[PDB]
Amino acid sequence: MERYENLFAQLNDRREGAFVPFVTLGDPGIEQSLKIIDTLIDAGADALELGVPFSDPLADGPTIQNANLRAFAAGVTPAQCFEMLALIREKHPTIPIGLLMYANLVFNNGIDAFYARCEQVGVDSVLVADVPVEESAPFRQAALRHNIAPIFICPPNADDDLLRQVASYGRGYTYLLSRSGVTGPLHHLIEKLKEYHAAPALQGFGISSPEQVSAAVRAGAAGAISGSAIVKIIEKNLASPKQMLAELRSFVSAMKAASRA
Amino acid sequence: MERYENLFAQLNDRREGAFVPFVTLGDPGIEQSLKIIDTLIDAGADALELGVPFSDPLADGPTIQNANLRAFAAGVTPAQCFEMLALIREKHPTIPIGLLMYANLVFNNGIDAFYARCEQVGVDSVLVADVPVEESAPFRQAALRHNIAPIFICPPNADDDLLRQVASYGRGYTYLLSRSGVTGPLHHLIEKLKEYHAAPALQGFGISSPEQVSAAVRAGAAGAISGSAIVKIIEKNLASPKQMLAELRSFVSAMKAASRA
Amino acid sequence: TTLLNPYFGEFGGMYVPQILMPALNQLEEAFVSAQKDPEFQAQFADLLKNYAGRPTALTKCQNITAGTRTTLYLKREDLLHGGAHKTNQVLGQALLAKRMGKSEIIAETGAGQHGVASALASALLGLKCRIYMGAKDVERQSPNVFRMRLMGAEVIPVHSGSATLKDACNEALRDWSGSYETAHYMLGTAAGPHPYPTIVREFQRMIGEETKAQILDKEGRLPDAVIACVGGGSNAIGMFADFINDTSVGLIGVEPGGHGIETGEHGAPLKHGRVGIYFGMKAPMMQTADGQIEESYSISAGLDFPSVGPQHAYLNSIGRADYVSITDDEALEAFKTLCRHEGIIPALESSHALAHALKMMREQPEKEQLLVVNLSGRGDKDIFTVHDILKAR
Amino acid sequence: TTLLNPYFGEFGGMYVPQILMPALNQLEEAFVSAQKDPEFQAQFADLLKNYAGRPTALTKCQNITAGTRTTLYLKREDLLHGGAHKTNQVLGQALLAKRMGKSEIIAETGAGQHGVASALASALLGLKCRIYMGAKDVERQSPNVFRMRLMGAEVIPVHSGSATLKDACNEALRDWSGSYETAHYMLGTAAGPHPYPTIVREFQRMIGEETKAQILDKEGRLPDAVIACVGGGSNAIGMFADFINDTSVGLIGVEPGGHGIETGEHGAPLKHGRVGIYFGMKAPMMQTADGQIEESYSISAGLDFPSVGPQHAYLNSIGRADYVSITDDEALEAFKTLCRHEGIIPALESSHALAHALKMMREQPEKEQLLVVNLSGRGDKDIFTVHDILKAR
Numbered sequence A, B: 001m002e003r004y005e006n007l008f009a010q011l012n013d014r015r016e017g018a019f020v021p022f023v024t025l026g027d028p029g030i031e032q033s034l035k036i037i038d039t040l041i042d043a044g045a046d047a048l049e050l051g052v053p054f055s056d057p058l059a060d061g062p063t064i065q066n067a068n069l070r071a072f073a074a075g076v077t078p079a080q081c082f083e084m085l086a087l088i089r090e091k092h093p094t095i096p097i098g099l100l101m102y103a104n105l106v107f108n109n110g111i112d113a114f115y116a117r118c119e120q121v122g123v124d125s126v127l128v129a130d131v132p133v134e135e136s137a138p139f140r141q142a143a144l145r146h147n148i149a150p151i152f153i154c155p156p157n158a159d160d161d162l163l164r165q166v167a168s169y170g171r172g173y174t175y176l177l178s179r180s181g182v183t184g185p186l187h188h189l190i191e192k193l194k195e196y197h198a199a200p201a202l203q204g205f206g207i208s209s210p211e212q213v214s215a216a217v218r219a220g221a222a223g224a225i226s227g228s229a230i231v232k233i234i235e236k237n238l239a240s241p242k243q244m245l246a247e248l249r250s251f252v253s254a255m256k257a258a259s260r261a
Numbered sequence C, D: 001t002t003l004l005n006p007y008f009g010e011f012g013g014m015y016v017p018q019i020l021m022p023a024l025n026q027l028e029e030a031f032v033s034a035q036k037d038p039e040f041q042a043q044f045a046d047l048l049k050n051y052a053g054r055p056t057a058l059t060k061c062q063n064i065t066a067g068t069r070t071t072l073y074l075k076r077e078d079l080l081h082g083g084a085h086k087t088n089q090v091l092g093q094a095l096l097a098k099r100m101g102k103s104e105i106i107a108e109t110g111a112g113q114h115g116v117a118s119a120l121a122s123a124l125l126g127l128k129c130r131i132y133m134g135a136k137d138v139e140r141q142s143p144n145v146f147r148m149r150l151m152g153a154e155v156i157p158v159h160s161g162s163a164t165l166k167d168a169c170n171e172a173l174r175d176w177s178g179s180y181e182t183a184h185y186m187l188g189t190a191a192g193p194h195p196y197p198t199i200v201r202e203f204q205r206m207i208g209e210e211t212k213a214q215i216l217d218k219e220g221r222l223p224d225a226v227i228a229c230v231g232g233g234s235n236a237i238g239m240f241a242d243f244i245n246d247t248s249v250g251l252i253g254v255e256p257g258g259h260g261i262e263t264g265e266h267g268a269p270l271k272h273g274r275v276g277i278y279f280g281m282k283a284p285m286m287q288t289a290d291g292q293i294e295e296s297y298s299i300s301a302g303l304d305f306p307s308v309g310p311q312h313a314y315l316n317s318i319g320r321a322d323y324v325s326i327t328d329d330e331a332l333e334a335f336k337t338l339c340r341h342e343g344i345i346p347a348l349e350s351s352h353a354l355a356h357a358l359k360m361m362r363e364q365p366e367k368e369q370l371l372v373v374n375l376s377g378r379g380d381k382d383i384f385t386v387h388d389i390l391k392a393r
């Protein structure tokens, strides 16, 4: 499939930057999760970014650590997340869907078979948080063999060697990290990334207000991703599901609107 | 004074062995203690042996350790014991009175002055439980200077060197120990002691029945001392003072009678 | 690019988020530099000797072996300052942090001992130390928590996930990845992302070098086997390394069998777990079938690391080392037996290794054998848990 | 008759009931014999080295002294097996009991450490050990009581008199005087009837011999002063002895000052007590004016011996040694300070000695001086008492 290439081209014909929210699948429960996701889409997300709950998410901040716990309080497992994915792809044809995984869950029952299951539910990309490019071979291979785009993080201090590896090895989009630390001056990377024909960059980590989406696009990034802020909203509204979707709606619309020409 | 020499000579003219009970001064209280003592005399003791309560009586068994504690529960101090002694000597002229002391209480305010205070209350002897002959010089001197007889213990394993030291250095009577351990085959010591003109031996430690008094005298000892058994009686009768004196009476009479020709 | 091999056969690597690689490359580089630097070595040798107490004795236990043909020696890491072998590598890691110009130290700890150890190295050497510890272990290790704090370290409890060592290990990483430029991460075992398994090994190897010398001095020849408990692998790799090229020398690693392998409730991923990718590396992990990391169980709090060093998995796979397990009862019996016949209270951890030696001896008492057990720590800290068990029983 | 002088000037002797003298003469004789016997020495040297960990390090503490002109070294008896210096002399006394053919050991203990120590020597060396301990201390030293029992000793509580160490010391004697023929009395300090002050000294003196060698090696010359806490005198005489003939070397003994000398509630009979005769000897005693023995007070349970070794009273009287006191607060400050700036938890006992060094330094920071403190034990055991105090405060 080529959903990312397609979105990017479409957005480029609109002079638009892309806005992609992240959530954890099954947080706070499956049904509510599916509704959150549909609301994110209906409000304007260009692509989703979805996490599979994992026990030891060593690259995430508290916010998303609570999201995995809530998902685990509700019994959510990977096999359930995949069924979730499947019904998401069924409902929305063309939206790019990327996963944020930890290594163990992809290597667990064989790497290749994880990417194959990704292809059969219609996933478009997978970012594996704790596999650096230096260790990406098995994961990127298995990915391309099943038509999934392997995403990589380009750190703010990336040196030219790394820039080139990311531009060479990634596909679909490039995760441009705004900072060190865990989930909670880019013009150079971004130019250099274009220079090496990287996949379009999405700026990530700490995007939580519309001004930043606009600033990313101006900087030359094809878009921005926001998760913590999206999760904050969930975690703030657990007592009222309806108010949850409504605030999700408003925030996403606000974010998306900002990426517009 | 020569109360011991006098008693011994008298007893020898009666073909009698000597019977001397031990108690702790002030156990269970002063008044009761004074009455116990008078009862011991009235029942027949030939001489007394009196302990001054001390905090750390490392040569005594439990029985007499309880006696010191009871005496301490009642506030009894050495200065009080000496007043006790004084009124005892006032009441009974000729009875030999020996103290059983621990070193510290004699060395405390000057050795010489302890033996002088002994002489002014009329005490006849002092045995210091934790001063061996090897260390007796200062204590035996100070004793003879004030006319007090310094008592020494002749252990059952005593070798000839020791026998001679005891016979040379002691006066009034020789404490013949029946056994190692703490408060709770003597014919040789006894002959050897006579051989070296020791003071007359009193057999001590574990004498608690009349048969043993008789056996001591037969062995050649001039007599026997009993304390634990006497203290047992006290400790058994604390709830009834009158029964206390009565059983003391009966036991002492029984003991004394046994030393008789 | 790295300078050294990050892999022991298939196990090991560097699986950390991209933002941490410059830190592990820098660390590797500084360690390679240090190992060829005589000043660094002389300074390390001098603290191990005049501050930590090296070398540690090698102790023959005739009472234990009487009536059999085993001879048993224990390498007395229980005598090292701090009371366990961990103090060796912390001092080395601290001099490294120094050499990198970092001023802060970050460490994770389960049962407390690596936290006490990093706090003492820190205090001595002028570093500001913060330690992460899972709230469950905090609750149950107050002595330790107070020791680290008497030594100026800051102790930060971790409430997420199972709230134990692995959740401390995540919180350590998260922090390193935003402060690596001033802080160094003093990982506590020979595990985790390269170059840590290699550097922990090399800073613990004096345990096997001194063992070898001592045993040659006292017996005239190398042991038939060296045995050591395996919690995350540092003490055992420390005792093994220098004997690895001595083919006739047995290396036996002892993982906690807990209530029993069949029961599930154990700590023995190397022989009873399944390969996974976690904590920066690929190795045997305690894990569900869907791949979530689980906790290791054992009557001794310090064999809690739910995975094992990569180099041990390699050694095992090629046959060069052997790994077995010992249950809580077996380890308590061995504890008792040492207290009463040699007058050394061993750590429950090192109790496991002694226990397997005793089995070697007992099961074949007329076999002629010379064993060394690595007594990785002292058991003063375990006195009460053994107490409460022997009371209920 | 004895073979050696039972007196240090006016202090010391053999004040025991007559029934015990053949035992002390026999002991003296066997000790004199042993000291000229190369087999005995080689066997003692071998346990001190391969079982107990000797020699112990000498540790320079630059962090403590920075900014001053003191240089301070601590002799790390905290690293000796058992955790304190007491293990030295117990091993020696046990080999003696052996050499006499006795098979049982009797020991008294206050805070538990001499009881743990005699039980470990006993277990190692095949002796049956029973330990007397005052019920008050039993109550408050359960770790210790359980340690001794894990090591096969029998622990007998003493309920008479103040129920503390002196009442244990009486119960030890009483028993020895009826079983001396099979049992040996392993007295716990350099005190009591001759020949014990001399034998404890000679079996602790390696502490000063090694100190001297080490300090000559590291500094080129002898210390200006050696400092050590004084509970009953064994660690301090141990550190002092070998420097006694070195006139330029200061010997400073530190007795616990408790809440304060003026308050009365202290442990410093050598400088604030009065000569008495007790426990087999003539020395300074804590005592009332009528002469009953009283207890020593201190925040550290092990400086509880209500008297002090005779040889220290002699050394003091001739000027050759100096004795001072340090209060509980001062000793707690020194405890804290070591934990936080060198990462060694010292025993509250040895805390007193460090505290007086720190005063020497602090009161005259531009004086040029080289001090050694004898760190007689580790303070793991004191962690909670320091905890409870720092909480109330």
Ligand SMILES: O=C(O)CNC(=O)Cc1c[nH]c2ccccc12
Residues within 6 Å of the ligand: A022, A049, A051, A059, A060, A064, A100, A129, A153, A183, A184, A204, A205, A206, A207, A225, A226, A227, A228, A229, C017
């Ligand atoms: O929380 C955010 O703002 C952004 N998060 C993402 O883009 C999703 C994410 C979860 N954990 C991560 C670890 C590394 C990279 C991205 C993530």
Ligand SMILES: O=C(O)CNC(=O)Cc1c[nH]c2ccccc12
Residues within 6 Å of the ligand: B022, B049, B051, B059, B060, B064, B100, B129, B153, B183, B184, B204, B205, B206, B207, B225, B226, B227, B228, B229, D017
């Ligand atoms: O208890 C006894 O049977 C005998 N006691 C005495 O003769 C008195 C005594 C008390 N403590 C002692 C210590 C040594 C010698 C005699 C005694």
Ligand SMILES: *Cc1c(COP(=O)(O)O)cnc(C)c1O
Residues within 6 Å of the ligand: C084, C085, C086, C113, C114, C188, C189, C190, C229, C230, C231, C232, C233, C234, C235, C236, C302, C303, C347, C349, C350, C376, C377, C378
């Ligand atoms: C921490 C510890 C261990 C376990 O960790 P390893 O790395 O597996 O050695 C073993 N023994 C003791 C005494 C420990 O403190």
Ligand SMILES: *Cc1c(COP(=O)(O)O)cnc(C)c1O
Residues within 6 Å of the ligand: D084, D085, D086, D113, D114, D188, D189, D190, D229, D230, D231, D232, D233, D234, D235, D236, D302, D303, D347, D349, D350, D376, D377, D378
């Ligand atoms: C027992 C002990 C002491 C006191 O006894 P000394 O004979 O006075 O040395 C001092 N320090 C420590 C650590 C002790 O265990």
Ligand code: NA
Residues within 6 Å of the ligand: C230, C231, C232, C267, C268, C269, C296, C303, C304, C305, C306, C307, C308
């Ligand atoms: Na493990």
Ligand code: NA
Residues within 6 Å of the ligand: D230, D231, D232, D267, D268, D269, D296, D303, D304, D305, D306, D307, D308
């Ligand atoms: Na004292």
